[PDB]
């Protein structure tokens, strides 16, 4: 569970990197598809699914907007992300094993973009937060 210390660290980090949310998502989504090929299938309806793709870019904004929502709903991830959980479980049928994969790609991207801000202490709290986000997205699965 997220402590007040964890919540404060995540809000402080997001305050610092939030401005680059769109770029973080485009990059995280690009990596996921390339490094974990089992994920490409969920985006095959897009004309182009490569790192350069305009579809990847547009959706990357939506993924980090969901992370921004998670930061605002940090006190109750289950309730805050319930609608996104329903969507991934029922409508998109995204296998839940992939949430932790995208989370790892987001950590990698934040590290490439904000080496100074992404200290080990920022990393531990953000990782506990992303685990909570994955568990919340998994809410409607079973």
């Amino acid at each position: 569970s997220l402590s007040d210390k964890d919540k404060a660290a995540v809000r402080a980090l997001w305050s610092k990197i939030g401005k680059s949310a769109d770029a973080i998502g485009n990059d995280a989504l690009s990596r996921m598809i390339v490094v974990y090929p089992q994920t490409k299938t969920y985006f095959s309806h897009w004309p182009d699914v490569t790192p350069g793709s305009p579809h990847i870019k547009a959706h990357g904004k939506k993924v980090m907007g969901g992370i921004a929502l998670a930061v605002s709903k940090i006190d109750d991830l289950k309730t805050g992300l319930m609608e996104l959980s329903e969507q991934h479980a029922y409508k998109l049928r995204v296998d839940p094993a992939n949430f932790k994969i995208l989370n790892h790609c987001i950590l990698v991207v934040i590290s490439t973009m904000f080496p100074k801000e992404f200290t080990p202490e920022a990393h531990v709290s953000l990782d506990k937060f992303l685990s909570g986000v994955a568990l919340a997205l998994a809410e409607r699965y079973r």
Binding site: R31, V34, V35, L107, V108, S111, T112, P120, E121, H123
Partner: protein, 141 residues
């Protein structure tokens, strides 16, 4: 794994430009703060961990340890057999710890390389660490 020539070149390049003395200690101290239960091994706060010479020494050993894998990419499981035994038998390191460490190595490298740590780069690097992690943790395959 059947390495492509491009993978061999990527891994060779990354390792030739990595400063082990800097990356090693960072990766291990990061691992000790993010998954603090791994700290038990180096006690024989965050600030303290980051400057701890014992932590630094082993972090550097880890990177030199990966180098023999880089030297013979087709004989990795054999190469790490002994180190595997040491860590389980004598050190009681939980096999899950190799994967946690790694992710920390990848994240510290990503921070050093910045945008040069492209998706293709991350894929080759993580694939090489996965093979080493399997040999150390002694996974069934």
């Amino acid at each position: 794994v059947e390495w492509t020539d491009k993978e061999r070149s990527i891994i060779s390049d990354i390792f030739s430009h990595m400063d082990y003395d800097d990356i090693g200690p960072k990766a291990l101290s990061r691992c000790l703060i993010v998954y603090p239960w791994t700290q038990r091994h180096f006690s024989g706060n965050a600030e303290a961990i980051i400057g701890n010479a014992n932590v630094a020494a082993h972090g550097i050993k880890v990177l030199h340890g990966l180098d023999r894998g880089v030297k013979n990419m087709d004989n990795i499981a054999a190469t790490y057999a002994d180190l595997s035994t040491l860590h389980s038998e004598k050190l009681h390191v939980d096999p899950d710890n190799f994967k946690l460490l790694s992710d920390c190595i990848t994240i510290v490298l990503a921070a050093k390389m910045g945008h040069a740590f492209t998706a293709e780069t991350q894929g080759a690097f993580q694939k090489f660490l996965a093979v080493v992690v399997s040999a150390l943790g002694k996974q069934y395959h």
